[PDB]
Amino acid sequence: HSLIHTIKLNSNKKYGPGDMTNGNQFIISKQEWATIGAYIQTGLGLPVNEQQLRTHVNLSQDISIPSDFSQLYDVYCSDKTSAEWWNKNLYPLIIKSANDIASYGFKVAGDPSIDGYFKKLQDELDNIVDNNSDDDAIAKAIKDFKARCGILIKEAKQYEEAAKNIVTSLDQFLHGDQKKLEGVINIQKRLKEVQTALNQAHGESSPAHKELLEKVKNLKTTLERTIKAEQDLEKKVEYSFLLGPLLGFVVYEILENTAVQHIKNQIDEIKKQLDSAQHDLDRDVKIIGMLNSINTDIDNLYSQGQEAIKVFQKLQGIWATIGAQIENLRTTSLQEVQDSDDADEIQIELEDASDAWLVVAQEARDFTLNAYSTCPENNFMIYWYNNSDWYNN
């Protein structure tokens, strides 16, 4: 809370980490990635054929499935693959960019009881402007200084390139990869089209259709508003399928909040109504309710993705500027120090910049520490099927 505000204050400081914040959030935001990841787990567990669909929504074998429902299957496989792709190629990059920030910050700022790289640069300046230093100590110091700065510059450039690479993966995620990868934009468009068709055809069949499907939609809107509202996560990220296929996975921590549990109980009530309902209503409400929630999800995947693109272009800009400032320090500034025989301003700047770096490095460490870690089908839901009240009778 305090930490975010401070980072903004420090953002201007020369030799500093710049503005590593997003809104009220650290630039790699724990809550954001945890939530989006929930939508991804849901995606990864989607069912691609009739039998899989029946098993997933827990629909009786004794119940017939109309033929037009079949269009869902094709779009679901893409959505599932999309989820898998995201899992292999995009999410691990975010962890990496966080780890890089922690590494740089701890290098320049120092150990909790230890000297950081900035402390070494400062002492080297002390030796360069000391009039007792002979030429040799100066030649050595200028050399040590330039080399170490060279290392920071090289790492910064690498991180600049990694953030660029994250932006590129997001563009492929949203727009497809010119390969076997279909863009989310197209998945959203396709999902919506199937939604309209199936809702006209099987949404409106009976008063109870309109009622119950609207009730789930109401629940989905309500759950999400709560999700975007619950800004702070204090625990390790896990996922939960307690709310079942009607709503999808949520971050486990969110279970703690009172409103959601009420939702879990209300969802159990809806479940009770459907399991003994007329078959036609029961099948329609399961499938279209779920499909509707998936559509809300994909809307969030697109929206967040465009945001994340803007964010990592920012982080890229941040690393570029850091490298340019150390390259400036190394050459022009260093020459100025030799000519002026004065290092005090640069030194004080390094003290202040060091302090800002611990702050951002600690945020990066906490993120990584609390981040979730670890089409044949369909193994993925099997454990989940085991664990939800939804699937017991």
DSSP single-letter state for residue 181:
P
Task: Give the Cα separation of 171 and 308 in Å (integer).
Answer: 10
Token pair belonging to 225: 């508003």
State how far the Cα of 221 lies from the Cα of 228, in Å rounded to an integer. 11
Cα end-to-end distance, the chain, whole Å: 46
> For the purposes of burial, counting CB atoms within 10 Å of the CB of 386, is it exposed (0-12), middle (13-18) or buried (19 or more)?
exposed
SS3 332: helix
Is the Cβ–Cβ distance between 237 and 34 less than 8 Å?
yes
Q: What is the DSSP string of 39-50?
A: HHHHHHT---SH
CB 86 within 8 A of CB 173: yes
CB atoms within 10 A of CB 249: 23
- H-type alpha helices, the chain: 2-10, 30-44, 50-57, 71-85, 91-109, 117-129, 135-175, 184-198, 207-229, 244-247, 258-275, 279-328, 334-340, 344-370, 380-387
> How far lies 140's CA from each of 145, 153, 175, 339, 346, in Å?
9, 20, 53, 17, 19
Q: How many CB atoms lie within 10 A of CB 250?
A: 26
Q: Is the dihedral of CA 193, 197, 202, 208 positive or negative?
A: positive
Chain-centroid distance, C-alpha 318: 19
Chain centroid to CA 377: how far? Answer: 25
Residues sharing a CB contact under 8 Å with residue 188, sequence separation 6 or more, in sequence order: 295, 298, 299, 301, 302
- Read off φ and ψ for residue 251, nearest 5 degrees: -60, 130
* Tokens coding 265: 């109980």
Query: How far apart are alpha carbons 370 and 34 in whole angstroms?
Result: 9
With residue 22 as reference, give the H or E element that holds it. strand 21-22
User: What is the longest distance spanned by two Cα atoms in the chain?
Assistant: 95
